[PDB]
Write an enzyme that holds these catalytic residues in place. Structure first.
Site, PDB file in Angstrom:
ATOM      1  CG  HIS A 532     -15.293 -21.616-100.285  1.00  0.00           C
ATOM      2  ND1 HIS A 532     -14.316 -22.317 -99.874  1.00  0.00           N
ATOM      3  CD2 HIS A 532     -16.389 -21.558 -99.559  1.00  0.00           C
ATOM      4  CE1 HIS A 532     -15.046 -22.955 -98.858  1.00  0.00           C
ATOM      5  NE2 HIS A 532     -16.226 -22.266 -98.657  1.00  0.00           N
ATOM      6  CD  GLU A 533     -19.357 -18.797 -99.658  1.00  0.00           C
ATOM      7  OE1 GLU A 533     -20.078 -19.532 -99.807  1.00  0.00           O
ATOM      8  OE2 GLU A 533     -18.420 -18.808 -98.756  1.00  0.00           O
ATOM      9  CG  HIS A 536     -20.141 -23.977-100.835  1.00  0.00           C
ATOM     10  ND1 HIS A 536     -19.818 -25.052-100.467  1.00  0.00           N
ATOM     11  CD2 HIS A 536     -19.509 -23.083 -99.838  1.00  0.00           C
ATOM     12  CE1 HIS A 536     -18.958 -25.106 -99.375  1.00  0.00           C
ATOM     13  NE2 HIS A 536     -18.783 -23.853 -99.093  1.00  0.00           N
ATOM     14  CD  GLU A 595     -17.717 -25.332 -96.451  1.00  0.00           C
ATOM     15  OE1 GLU A 595     -16.814 -24.475 -96.733  1.00  0.00           O
ATOM     16  OE2 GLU A 595     -19.009 -25.248 -96.171  1.00  0.00           O
ATOM     17  CG  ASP A 599     -11.334 -24.664 -98.564  1.00  0.00           C
ATOM     18  OD1 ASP A 599     -11.891 -23.559 -98.787  1.00  0.00           O
ATOM     19  OD2 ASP A 599     -11.054 -25.400 -97.712  1.00  0.00           O
ATOM     20  CG  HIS A 660     -15.599 -24.796 -92.614  1.00  0.00           C
ATOM     21  ND1 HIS A 660     -16.858 -24.629 -91.768  1.00  0.00           N
ATOM     22  CD2 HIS A 660     -16.086 -23.934 -93.668  1.00  0.00           C
ATOM     23  CE1 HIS A 660     -17.656 -23.983 -92.166  1.00  0.00           C
ATOM     24  NE2 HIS A 660     -17.506 -23.606 -93.484  1.00  0.00           N
ATOM     25  NE  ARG A 666     -11.042 -23.830 -95.218  1.00  0.00           N
ATOM     26  CZ  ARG A 666     -12.278 -23.039 -94.960  1.00  0.00           C
ATOM     27  NH1 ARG A 666     -12.761 -22.833 -93.801  1.00  0.00           N
ATOM     28  NH2 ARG A 666     -13.040 -23.141 -96.038  1.00  0.00           N
TER      29      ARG A 666
HETATM   30  O1  LIG Z   1     -15.047 -21.565 -94.576  1.00  0.00           O
HETATM   31  C1  LIG Z   1     -15.833 -20.660 -94.745  1.00  0.00           C
HETATM   32  N1  LIG Z   1     -16.267 -19.926 -93.575  1.00  0.00           N
HETATM   33  C2  LIG Z   1     -15.748 -20.333 -92.190  1.00  0.00           C
HETATM   34  C3  LIG Z   1     -14.981 -18.837 -91.900  1.00  0.00           C
HETATM   35  C4  LIG Z   1     -13.940 -19.359 -90.807  1.00  0.00           C
HETATM   36  S1  LIG Z   1     -14.657 -20.050 -89.178  1.00  0.00           S
HETATM   37  C5  LIG Z   1     -15.254 -21.842 -89.493  1.00  0.00           C
HETATM   38  C6  LIG Z   1     -14.962 -22.634 -88.501  1.00  0.00           C
HETATM   39  C7  LIG Z   1     -16.156 -22.449 -87.352  1.00  0.00           C
HETATM   40  C8  LIG Z   1     -17.348 -22.902 -88.093  1.00  0.00           C
HETATM   41  C9  LIG Z   1     -17.811 -21.810 -89.103  1.00  0.00           C
HETATM   42  C10 LIG Z   1     -18.300 -20.390 -88.319  1.00  0.00           C
HETATM   43  O2  LIG Z   1     -17.581 -19.237 -88.766  1.00  0.00           O
HETATM   44  O3  LIG Z   1     -19.271 -20.335 -87.641  1.00  0.00           O
HETATM   45  N2  LIG Z   1     -16.682 -21.227 -89.900  1.00  0.00           N
HETATM   46  C11 LIG Z   1     -17.009 -20.703 -91.276  1.00  0.00           C
HETATM   47  O4  LIG Z   1     -17.912 -20.605 -91.638  1.00  0.00           O
HETATM   48  C12 LIG Z   1     -16.561 -20.421 -95.993  1.00  0.00           C
HETATM   49  S2  LIG Z   1     -17.959 -21.163 -96.090  1.00  0.00           S
HETATM   50  C13 LIG Z   1     -16.455 -18.904 -96.304  1.00  0.00           C
HETATM   51  C14 LIG Z   1     -15.010 -18.499 -96.237  1.00  0.00           C
HETATM   52  C15 LIG Z   1     -14.314 -19.273 -97.205  1.00  0.00           C
HETATM   53  C16 LIG Z   1     -12.857 -18.903 -97.274  1.00  0.00           C
HETATM   54  C17 LIG Z   1     -12.180 -17.874 -96.475  1.00  0.00           C
HETATM   55  C18 LIG Z   1     -13.142 -16.913 -95.886  1.00  0.00           C
HETATM   56  C19 LIG Z   1     -14.554 -17.341 -95.651  1.00  0.00           C
HETATM   57 ZN   LIG Z   2     -17.686 -23.008 -97.398  1.00  0.00          ZN
END
Ligand SMILES: O=C(N[C@H]1CCS[C@H]2CCC[C@@H](C(=O)O)N2C1=O)[C@@H](S)Cc1ccccc1
Ligand SMILES: [Zn+2]
Ligand SMILES: *[C@@H]1O[C@H](CO)[C@@H](O)[C@H](O)[C@H]1NC(C)=O
Ligand SMILES: *[C@@H]1O[C@H](CO)[C@@H](O)[C@H](O)[C@H]1NC(C)=O
Ligand SMILES: *[C@@H]1O[C@H](CO)[C@@H](O)[C@H](O)[C@H]1NC(C)=O
Ligand SMILES: *[C@@H]1O[C@H](CO)[C@@H](O)[C@H](O)[C@H]1NC(C)=O
Length: 698
Positions: A532-533, A536, A595, A599, A660, A666
């Site tokens: 995923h990262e 990006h 995002e 994914d 996201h 997702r």
């Molecule tokens: O999907 C992501 N990360 C999310 C983590 C879940 S919560 C989501 C919704 C609210 C806004 C934001 C927040 O955590 O503040 N956010 C994130 O960053 C990516 S980049 C990193 C990731 C990818 C796949 C699995 C786990 C991590």
């Molecule tokens: Zn991401």
């Protein structure tokens, strides 16, 4: 030998997978319900949560560790750690905070040119010397609060080693510009917003022993709302800010003055004066040939006829409110409670989280390296770092190998993509020197001095510190050793300006990763996160930045056109998802595109790496109590990362503000596009989870 793994670690994984899933649902009809239906039946969103699920549970559990390491002094603690613990103690002492009432805010208001609605004779006291340049700059430079015009020092998109002044549109008091329609699903939030203004104005006037005229309060605060409505409608939508090449507009301050004039309170706005009022706080002089990156030229143009209609008083009523609304929760209970209806309207919550949780997170957010050190010493295992390093190397190589199979890119662009992928800098766990270099850690916080009975002064000190730090970087080179996240974080990150991926210690734990859990689970968890990262770096934003973090086009015309063609499939796919918790509204397929690209590409990269692992090492022993092979477990663990649900109020919020997709989509969207998923669960063609049309970028 029955072929079944029977270790304690396999037992813990299996029990979790079994408890979360609902095997009475057909996986090819709805894999969210199959993977997560058991979790959904067993759980209810807490009163203090706007969202709940396995991600939120991990964050709640990390907070428990922070409590354990912050709440007890130790004799050997270095000054950096002493400061974090003193800050924590100042934050949790509600008796000391409550005994001060609103006095700390009252002392502060003269320093921001007052709040007219809670001030007698504002025009004589502050209007006489008021200028938009000074009033906006004071909030920005001293308190980090950007109102009307957001000026900040950041990295130059087109020269990643340098910093440059940026000008952009400001954030709003409500979650997004859509809220300012103030009808239907937004009405309660708008009503609560103005009532919140009125309630705080009333409390301040009461504490200052000023008369209360309820009709006057409503008149002024509804004028604040009418002003911010115009500001909101002038801002650009996120969909119109998604092309970094078009967003980047570099010009001199003289150009800015020629092209974006403003008349405020009857006075011509001096961009040079405004900029120097800010930069002077860090002893930096600015002339009219200073280069500036203007991210929101249309907004500034639209602001001109708006601000000619409002007085200094009208503007300061909004400007000071936007700061005050952030501060009331650092004051006494009476001020804290004034936010209740506003919080419920934006988040659906009926109570604030435990004081020790808010405080642990606050200290972690402001002293990420000191808290990170305490966290990893308590909770992060040795060889983990090296295992994850090796997983990153595998997935990086899978990305590069997949380039040959991608038919929508020409050879030249593939070579440039490999160049960038090889240059991605990986950061795993924590920076070693937060543990090994006490001097450096102490010196990061040397200018901070906390008092344990003065929480408010402590948080104000932190606002000033972090803004002073940011501004002072203007003439400095970007520090390549800096990490884009603290270690005590359950998340992962990519930075296009640094071309850096980070996996903090907080995410290197089950269900994502354990050196002792099955590899199917590791690849489906952290493996997917790693892909995923990396992906990006190649999404609709990242693909515009090269190997060194510079905004430069390295795509042929055809390959770029094809990227948009391929990614448009996903815009339509996710944009067609209707979210029941958000009132049936459709996701924003443009705003979630990056995002969603990450994914879909990341899961495939992780799966292909797991296949290579099996090729080299053979099948793993099966998990007990689960009639699932390891290909199936790979996808089940991926899905259970996203088990969770949302309060309807917060779904209305997140569908407009989150880049996201919601967890359930997702899962559905990614697996709908995965031929490998449908092979693993033998889905019939055109079952819900196996549409004949599948989107693919990476
Ligand atoms: O999907 C992501 N990360 C999310 C983590 C879940 S919560 C989501 C919704 C609210 C806004 C934001 C927040 O955590 O503040 N956010 C994130 O960053 C990516 S980049 C990193 C990731 C990818 C796949 C699995 C786990 C991590
Ligand atoms: Zn991401
Ligand atoms: C909280 O602050 C008050 C006032 O300064 C002080 O008397 C009390 O000891 C503090 N409580 C703790 C647990 O430190
Ligand atoms: C919102 O902004 C647009 C563009 O400037 C303008 O045409 C429209 O009239 C504005 N709407 C309101 C209600 O001010
Ligand atoms: C900005 O202009 C004001 C007058 O409105 C003046 O008092 C102040 O010194 C100026 N600041 C700078 C940094 O030039
Ligand atoms: C839904 O998908 C169709 C088919 O691609 C597309 O034409 C339409 O614009 C999509 N709708 C949304 C809201 O994304």
């Amino acid at each position: 030998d029955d072929g079944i793994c029977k270790s304690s670690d396999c037992i813990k994984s299996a029990a979790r997978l079994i408890q979360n899933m609902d095997a009475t649902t057909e996986p090819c009809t709805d894999f969210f319900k199959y993977a997560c239906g058991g979790w959904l039946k067993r759980n209810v969103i807490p009163e203090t949560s706007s969202r709940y699920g396995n991600f939120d549970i991990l964050r709640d559990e990390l907070e428990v560790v922070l409590k354990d390491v912050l709440q007890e002094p130790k004799t050997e603690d270095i000054v950096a750690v002493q400061k974090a613990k003193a800050l924590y103690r100042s934050c949790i002492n509600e008796s000391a905070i409550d005994s001060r009432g609103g006095e700390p805010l009252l002392k502060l208001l003269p320093d921001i040119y007052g709040w007219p609605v809670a001030t007698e004779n504002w025009e004589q006291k502050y209007g006489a010397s008021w200028t938009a340049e000074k009033a906006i700059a004071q909030l920005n430079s001293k308190y980090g609060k950007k109102v009307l015009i957001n000026l900040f020092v950041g990295t130059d998109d087109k020269n990643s080693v340098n910093h440059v002044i940026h000008i952009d549109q400001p954030r709003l008091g409500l979650p997004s510009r859509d809220y300012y329609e103030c009808t239907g699903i937004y009405k309660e939030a708008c009503t609560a917003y103005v009532d919140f203004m009125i309630s705080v104005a009333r409390l301040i006037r009461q504490e200052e022993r000023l008369p209360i005229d309820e009709n006057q309060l409503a008149l002024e605060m509804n004028k604040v709302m009418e002003l911010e409505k115009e500001i909101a409608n002038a801002t650009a939508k996120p969909e119109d800010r998604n092309d970094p090449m078009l967003l980047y507009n570099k010009m001199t301050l003289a150009q800015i003055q020629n092209n974006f004039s403003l008349e405020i309170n009857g006075k011509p706005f001096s961009w040079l004066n405004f900029t120097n009022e800010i930069m002077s706080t860090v002893n930096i002089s600015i002339t009219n040939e200073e280069d500036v990156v203007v991210y929101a030229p249309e907004y500034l143009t639209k602001l001109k006829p708006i601000l000619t209609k409002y007085s200094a008083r009208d503007l300061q009523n909004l400007m000071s409110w936007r700061f005050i609304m952030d501060l009331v929760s650092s004051l006494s209970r009476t001020y804290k409670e004034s936010r209740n209806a506003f919080r419920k309207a934006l988040y659906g919550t009926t109570s604030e989280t435990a004081t020790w949780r808010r405080c642990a997170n606050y200290v972690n957010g402001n002293m990420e390296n000191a808290v990170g050190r305490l966290y990893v010493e308590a909770a992060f295992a040795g060889e983990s770092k090296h295992v994850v390093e090796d997983l990153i190397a595998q997935i990086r190589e899978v990305f590069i190998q997949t380039l040959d199979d991608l038919t929508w890119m020409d050879a030249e662009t593939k070579k440039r993509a490999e160049e960038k992928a090889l240059a991605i800098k990986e950061r795993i766990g924590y920076p070693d020197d937060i543990v090994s270099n006490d001097n450096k850690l102490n010196n990061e916080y040397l200018e901070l001095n906390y008092k344990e009975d003065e929480y408010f002064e402590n948080i104000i000190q932190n606002l000033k510190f972090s803004q002073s730090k940011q501004l002072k970087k203007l003439r400095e080179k970007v520090d390549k050793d800096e990490w884009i996240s603290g270690a005590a974080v359950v998340n992962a990150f990519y930075s296009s300006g640094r071309n850096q991926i980070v996996f903090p210690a907080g995410i290197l734990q089950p269900p994502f990763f354990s050196a002792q859990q099955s590899n199917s689970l590791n690849y489906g968890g952290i493996g997917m996160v790693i892909g995923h990262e990396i992906t990006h770096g190649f999404d609709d934003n990242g693909r515009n930045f090269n190997k060194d973090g510079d905004l430069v086009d390295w795509w042929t015309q055809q390959s770029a056109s094809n990227f948009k063609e391929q990614s448009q499939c996903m815009v339509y796919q996710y944009g067609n998802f209707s979210w029941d918790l958000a009132g049936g509204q459709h996701l924003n397929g443009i705003n979630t595109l990056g995002e969603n690209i990450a994914d879909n590409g990341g899961l495939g990269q992780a799966y292909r790496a797991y296949q290579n692992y099996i090729k080299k090492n053979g099948e793993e022993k099966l998990l007990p109590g689960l009639d699932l092979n390891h290909k199936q477990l790979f996808f089940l663990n991926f899905a259970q990362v996203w088990c969770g649900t949302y309060r309807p109020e917060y779904a209305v919020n997140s569908i407009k503000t989150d880049v996201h997709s919601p967890g359930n989509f997702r899962i559905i969207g990614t697996l709908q596009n995965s031929a490998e998923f449908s092979e693993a669960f033998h889905c019939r063609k055109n079952s819900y989870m196996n549409p004949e049309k599948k989107c693919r970028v990476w």
